[PDB]
RNA sequence: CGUGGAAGUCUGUUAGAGUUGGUGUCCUACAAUACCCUCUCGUGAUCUAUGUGUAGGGGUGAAAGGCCCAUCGAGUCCGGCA
RNA sequence: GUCGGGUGAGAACCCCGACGGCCUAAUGGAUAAGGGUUCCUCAGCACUGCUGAUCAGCUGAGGGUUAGCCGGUCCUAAGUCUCACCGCAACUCGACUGAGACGAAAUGGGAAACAGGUUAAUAUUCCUGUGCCAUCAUGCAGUGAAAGUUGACGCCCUGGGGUCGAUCACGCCGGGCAUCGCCCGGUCGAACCGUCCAACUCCGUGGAAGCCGUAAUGGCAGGAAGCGGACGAACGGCGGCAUAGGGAAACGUGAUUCAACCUGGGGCCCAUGAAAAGACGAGCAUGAUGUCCGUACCGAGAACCGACACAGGUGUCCAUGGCGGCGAAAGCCAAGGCCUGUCGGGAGCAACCAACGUUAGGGAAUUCGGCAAGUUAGUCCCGUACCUUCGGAAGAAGGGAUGCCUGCUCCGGAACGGAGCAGGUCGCAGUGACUCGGAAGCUCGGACUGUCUAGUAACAACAUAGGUGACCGCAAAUCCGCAAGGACUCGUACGGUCACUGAAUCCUGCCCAGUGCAGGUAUCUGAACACCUCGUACAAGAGGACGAAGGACCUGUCAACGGCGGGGGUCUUAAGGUAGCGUAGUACCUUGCCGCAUCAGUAGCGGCUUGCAUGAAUGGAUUAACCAGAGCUUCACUGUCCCAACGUUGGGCCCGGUGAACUGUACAUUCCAGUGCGGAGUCUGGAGACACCCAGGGGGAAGCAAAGACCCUAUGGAGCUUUACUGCAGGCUGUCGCUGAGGACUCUCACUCCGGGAGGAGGACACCGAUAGCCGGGCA
RNA sequence: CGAGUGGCUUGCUACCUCGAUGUCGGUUCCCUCCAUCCUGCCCGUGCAGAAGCGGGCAAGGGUGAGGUUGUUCGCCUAUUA
RNA sequence: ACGACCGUAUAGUACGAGAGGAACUACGGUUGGUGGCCACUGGUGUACCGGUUGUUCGAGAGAGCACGUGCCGGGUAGCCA
């Protein structure tokens, strides 16, 4: 079976959903963690310096 | 008794299986009463179809060589 | 290279674990205060998923219901005893001191009160040899003479299920079913059948180990494969 | 002679799984792996849904350097970076 | 699809009727996920729709989803998280241990709802009727109440009970057809309450020494049959429910086979087949309460995923509609659905192409190769070789039969079940279509079923059982973690780890020199601390003494890595190739030589065999069975071929509509020669050449598509290797600290482990922290 | 021994092409060359004849089917002018 | 747009001791190639006619489907070798 089109048809699982904390559709309903803001992982908001150029 | 295996597995394998299973399926004298009514219930588990005595013994024999030694000493 | 299979093992992932949740009981010697006064009746005989051998369900006088590592010849209705002054009959458990020499024993303790360690597999047994005020010598199933504390408890008789090893698995399916009940990854791909990246014996245009198989005891994990610190190999000589 | 009904047992497009040949059709496709016929398995080391675990020099691997979201002899994203 | 017709400015494709078709595990019905309003109505056509559109999943506006008893909600599963504790430089990191919580919507467990009616759209939710559950309140009863039962369970075979459905018989209602008198549909009616009980278990009686019983196993003086009895089932029977409901009407009765559902018997395991909540145990009346969330629609060749109205992908239940037949098979047909796998019109419709039918004579001559195609075929009877692990081979092979009609026999309770008989009779053909093996032999490989390169490899590769070696007594061996800690392990040598070989059978020789591993070791070598000498008012430093693991040295070991020759009638370097097999999937020479087979055989097989460069768990030989594995031979068959023809369907061609892309320095009607950076439409010399258009098969544009994979180069990259260089983990070992009392020893008090504890074992060791030497492609 | 012609084999060279001029063998379809295998016409003969042998002119036409091998090449069989 | 071969007569002749054994010419045919044509033989012929299996239309009659003829038998014109 091809990893392409034929393997795409099984994708009917819900993972990322609207986050209660940040509003972004990144709250993984299985992991119960927001990939965007870290809700469910940390009290502090997810943020990284690599999200922008080093001089900014 | 290894006819279930057909022309597969070779002499030794199905020959020892037939033997082990033959002696396993033999009439066994119950330790409780005396009737040759002991049948295997599972791996190492035996029972008398007469008095209902359920007991432990060898995996395929109700009594093992080393098992008989126990009584003696 | 990549970590070898022996290294993935230690991580304790699902594939390498034993189906504990499917296991019945941690068959240990029942604890008794002192005096010995303790007996029970064999209520049933069950199959132990963890050892591929029978196990006796025993109900005690104080009302305690526990599975026991059954020796050969134990059946429903029988009365088992556990204590210093227990009867010297098969199925009973008492310290090595009270056990007469020359008598076959199983489920021996390593340190008094641990609940049993030695001789627990199908059909095996330890031979109680010497007595003393300080030490009781026992011959374990491997043939090793083991000096033990005479206070170490042990059960009389050989473990039930003897002869299990006599019948061949015959086919892969049978091995499959047994393996599924143990903490083991199966089947086994030969190292020599892998790529260099996957195992020290991998690679080559034909299958053969790189260097010799006998590896030093000091070898680090990832390299300790083949014949671990072998004192010799082969059959001749 | 009958009874019995065993089997990683046989036939089988039962369901289902797989994928030998045609080096057919297609090859700005219906399709970034498709179509047809043919063919293998089909009570078992079987197939399958859902839930769940293992994460990047790390997993997973009946081992093909296979697979880890069209990405693998070291995923992907952004950053180091002009 | 077609002919009529309807609406409309406009109709091939929007609607009605008729005729004609398509779908049958799905193209029907109910749903999970997922979508998210796509559902219904009205109004529309700028957009979307492979053409058009009056239509629409499109545009706009409105509307639509109603629950004590269907799900959720509750329970616990693999497992997840939180808090505490501990680690970490630290944390949003991290393992354990506690506590708490989370974790199942078709498809785990679970208190209780059925029937009908109703809307444009909901419906076990609304309405009508009937019923049921839980909690609580009051009244009565009851003092029992928690032991127990249940929830609650694997795989294979099978009996009995039994509903729906299907069919049969007969009756009644309605329809159809019209030479007959046959054919179709209907003939209804729940939850619930009450009642009945087979199987299993048990009791009394009885008293079998051979009887009782089964599909089968089986049962018995430890008490069989028989008789009586206790307990005891259906989603089943029976009565009510029901002068409920439903039907135009009748508004049946019996039977067979029996899904569901109920209840038993047998067999299997180196496999043992959840848990918890809850329920029962534990009465009755009357009344009250039963909140919160989901509920539309699609569920797919247009509502999901795949950029698309994508020929792909995507779970569940309907597996009992009719004929057919072994059948959930083919083929045909209902119910139900559809003509939207959504562009049409025209040309005996050319060439050419895709699918396909038939081809005389020959019959594999085709080709690397029977690739492709074809041949065979269902069922019964007869009959069946070598070989073999005695299972198999085997449907071997080969031979015969096969329909209809009339009348019957046998088995069985019977079937609308099965096996036969006699007579008659039709065709070229009776498994008449459909369904439906071609067969045989030799050789190689792997024993077998199984695995694999999702997307050029399915194989001889991997796995496997079997064989073997290694490590380890559990405070273990092996392995993960920086640590706290952890997998193996609810495990204990009949174990489990680490490796090799790869079923059976017959076997598995010689070599320990090198390398590896392990053991020993007089002596030699071997770091640091401490100690001693020199030196320095100290120190740097130099030397000495002692000396661990390791090395030298010695031994063991090849089912460890590997080796098994040259010469002469020993030498390198330990041995000097044993059984076997052999021109091999290993043999250069090579198409080796002889034979078989053929007209002819680099093939294939057998024999020989000096083997360039076979050979014994780097396993050797050999082998029944098995195989989408490699090679060869024969019979059969055939358009593979001689050698091609005709035909069928869809294209192609013409017309309406829709409407891309690749590609483009320029010029460009070329041809023959030459020249040129040596492979020119464009330069030179000639030749030819009126322009434009249609169809064609692809000769050229060193055609289009890709900054060559090959090769080299770069003081490029990466993966892999090792006795490359340099290091880093890790293991072993000494030393210092923790660390204490009386070159060997005793002890207990730190510390460690075992023990519920009391207490036991161990003990200044071990662990841990630090440093030193050794090993160290495990890693950088 | 000496002199050459060809450009089919092999070698040499590194001019051309590495922002690609698709391999060998085969097949199918077309054109050509002559150093002629057959066929026409000739000369010589160790030419009686028949059958040959050697040579000349000559490219109109022909030069086929099969067994092993991927083979080109070649070996083999039976036909053949 | 025609190439080549075989056969008969010449002839058992010339030649030759014999064995063996020609030619000119005239005829008949074959093979390869070429162009055309279909009376004849052959193929096709999902035009047509018949037989017949399963199922559906109640039987009969007469029809549909079984892949673009269910299968089997025969086969006109045309097109063809
Ligand atoms: Cl095992
Ligand atoms: Cl629901
Ligand atoms: Cl029964
Ligand atoms: Cl010939
Ligand atoms: K090039
Ligand atoms: Mg235990
Ligand atoms: Mg073993
Ligand atoms: Mg497992
Ligand atoms: Mg293996
Ligand atoms: Mg490999
Ligand atoms: Mg490789
Ligand atoms: Mg390596
Ligand atoms: Mg090998
Ligand atoms: Mg090997
Ligand atoms: Mg899963
Ligand atoms: Mg409308
Ligand atoms: Mg609706
Ligand atoms: Mg469509
Ligand atoms: Mg023919
Ligand atoms: Mg040929
Ligand atoms: Mg074929
Ligand atoms: Mg009868
Ligand atoms: Mg061969
Ligand atoms: Mg195989
Ligand atoms: Mg592949
Ligand atoms: Mg395959
Ligand atoms: Mg093994
Ligand atoms: Mg083994
Ligand atoms: Mg192998
Ligand atoms: Mg040979
Ligand atoms: Mg050997
Ligand atoms: Mg380049
Ligand atoms: Mg290269
Ligand atoms: Mg590099
Ligand atoms: Mg502890
Ligand atoms: Mg490296
Ligand atoms: Mg080209
Ligand atoms: Mg000439
Ligand atoms: Mg010419
Ligand atoms: Na029998
Ligand atoms: Na295929
Ligand atoms: Na990585
Ligand atoms: Na349309
Ligand atoms: Na009832
Ligand atoms: Na049927
Ligand atoms: Na199989
Ligand atoms: Na050696
Ligand atoms: Na060798
Ligand atoms: Na297979
Ligand atoms: Na044909
Ligand atoms: Na062209
Ligand atoms: Na690389
Ligand atoms: Na020349
Ligand atoms: Na070629
Ligand atoms: Na010529
Ligand atoms: Na040839
Ligand atoms: Sr899915
Ligand atoms: Sr978290
Ligand atoms: Sr931050
Ligand atoms: Sr334990
Ligand atoms: Sr314990
Ligand atoms: Sr290797
Ligand atoms: Sr030996
Ligand atoms: Sr099978
Ligand atoms: Sr292929
Ligand atoms: Sr196509
Ligand atoms: Sr393709
Ligand atoms: Sr085909
Ligand atoms: Sr099959
Ligand atoms: Sr960058
Ligand atoms: Sr318009
Ligand atoms: Sr609609
Ligand atoms: Sr919950
Ligand atoms: Sr449920
Ligand atoms: Sr099942
Ligand atoms: Sr029945
Ligand atoms: Sr609905
Ligand atoms: Sr549906
Ligand atoms: Sr589909
Ligand atoms: Sr597919
Ligand atoms: Sr219908
Ligand atoms: Sr349309
Ligand atoms: Sr015909
Ligand atoms: Sr052939
Ligand atoms: Sr041939
Ligand atoms: Sr026959
Ligand atoms: Sr072998
Ligand atoms: Sr696969
Ligand atoms: Sr063997
Ligand atoms: Sr050695
Ligand atoms: Sr020899
Ligand atoms: Sr010019
Ligand atoms: Sr064209
Ligand atoms: Sr010339
Ligand atoms: Sr000539
Ligand atoms: Sr060549
Ligand atoms: Sr050659
Ligand atoms: Sr003549
Ligand atoms: Sr003569
Ligand atoms: Sr038809």
Short description:
It is classed as ribosome. Keywords: anisomycin resistance, C2487U, large ribosomal subunit, 23S rRNA, Ribonucleoprotein, Ribosomal protein, RNA-binding, rRNA-binding, tRNA-binding, Metal-binding, Zinc-finger, ribosome. This is part of a larger assembly, with chains A (56 residues), B (73 residues) and C (237 residues). With 73 residues, chain B is α+β, with helices and mostly antiparallel strands.
User: How would a textbook summarize the main sheet of chain C?
Assistant: 6 strands, antiparallel
Number-wise, the strands of chain C total 12
In total, the number of domains of chain B comes to: 1
Q: Can you identify the CATH class of the largest domain in chain C?
A: Mainly Beta
PDB class: ribosome
Keywords: anisomycin resistance, C2487U, large ribosomal subunit, 23S rRNA, Ribonucleoprotein, Ribosomal protein, RNA-binding, rRNA-binding, tRNA-binding, Metal-binding, Zinc-finger, ribosome
Entry title: Structure of Anisomycin resistant 50S Ribosomal Subunit: 23S rRNA mutation C2487U
Chain A: 50S ribosomal protein L37e
Structure description:
- The structure is cut from a larger assembly and holds chains A (56 residues), B (73 residues) and C (237 residues).
- With 56 residues, chain A is mainly beta.
- Chain A has a single domain, classed as N-terminal domain of TfIIb, CATH 2.20.25.
- Chain A has one helix and three strands.
- Chain A has a three-stranded antiparallel beta sheet with strand order 1-2-3, with no helix packed on it.
- Chain A is flat.
- Chain B has one domain (1-73): N-terminal domain of TfIIb.
- In chain B, a hairpin with a 5-residue loop joins strand 2 (45-48) and strand 3.
- Chain C folds into three domains: 1-78, Beta Barrel (OB fold (Dihydrolipoamide Acetyltransferase, E2P)); 82-159, SH3 type barrels (Roll); 160-237, Irregular (Ribosomal protein L2, domain 3).
- Chain C is built from two helices and twelve strands, in the order αββββββββββαββ.
- Chain C has a six-stranded antiparallel beta sheet with strand order 5-10-6-7-8-9, with no helix packed on it. In chain C, strands 3-2-1-4 form a four-stranded antiparallel beta sheet, with no helix packed on it. A two-stranded parallel sheet of chain C has the order 11-12.
- The chains are: A mainly beta (56), B alpha+beta (73), C mainly beta (237).
- Chains B and C meet through helix 1, strand 3 and helix 2 of B and strand 1 and strand 2 of C.
- Bound molecules: chloride ion (4 copies), potassium ion (K), magnesium ion (MG) (34 copies), sodium ion (NA) (17 copies) and strontium ion (44 copies).
- The site of one magnesium ion has 3 residues of chain C, from loops.
- The structure holds four RNA strands.
- Chain C: It holds the Pfam family Ribosomal_L2.
């Amino acid at each position: 079976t091809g990893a392409g089109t034929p393997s795409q048809g099984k994708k009917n699982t819900t993972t990322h959903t609207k986050c209660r904390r940040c509003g972004e559709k990144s709250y993984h309903t299985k992991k119960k963690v927001c990939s965007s803001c870290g809700f469910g992982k940390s009290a502090k908001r997810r943020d990284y310096e690599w999200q922008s150029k080093a001089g900014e | 008794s290894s006819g279930r295996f057909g022309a597969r597995y070779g002499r030794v394998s199905r020959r020892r299986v037939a033997e082990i299973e033959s002696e396993m399926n033999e009439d066994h004298a119950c330790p409780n009463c005396g009737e040759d009514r002991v049948d295997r219930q599972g791996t190492g588990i035996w029972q008398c179809s007469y008095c209902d005595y359920k007991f432990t013994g060898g995996s395929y024999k109700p009594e093992t060589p080393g098992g008989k030694t126990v009584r003696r000493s | 290279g990549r970590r070898i299979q022996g290294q993935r093992r230690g991580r304790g992932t699902s594939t390498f674990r034993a189906p504990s949740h499917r296991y019945k009981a941690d068959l240990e010697h029942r604890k008794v205060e002192d005096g010995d006064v303790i007996a029970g009746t064999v209520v049933d005989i069950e199959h132990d998923p963890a050892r591929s051998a029978p196990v006796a369900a025993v109900e005690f006088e104080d009302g305690d219901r526990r599975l026991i590592l059954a020796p050969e010849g134990v059946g429903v209705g029988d009365e088992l005893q556990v204590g210093v002054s227990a009867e010297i009959a098969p199925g009973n458990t008492l310290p090595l001191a009270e056990i007469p020499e020359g008598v076959p024993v199983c489920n021996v303790e390593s340190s008094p009160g641990d609940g049993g360690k030695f001789a627990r597999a199908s059909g095996v047994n330890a031979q109680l040899l010497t007595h003393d005020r300080n030490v009781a010598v026992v011959k374990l199933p491997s043939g090793e003479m083991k000096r033990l504390d005479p206070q170490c408890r042990a059960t009389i008789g050989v473990v039930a299920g003897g002869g299990r090893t006599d019948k061949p698995f015959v086919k892969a399916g049978n091995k499959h079913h047994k393996m599924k009940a143990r903490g083991t990854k199966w089947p086994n791909v030969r190292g020599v059948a892998m790529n260099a990246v996957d195992h020290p014996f991998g690679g080559g245009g034909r299958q053969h180990p790189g260097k010799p198989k006998s590896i030093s005891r000091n070898a680090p994990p990832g390299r300790k494969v083949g014949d671990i610190a072998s004192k010799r190999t082969g059959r001749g000589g």
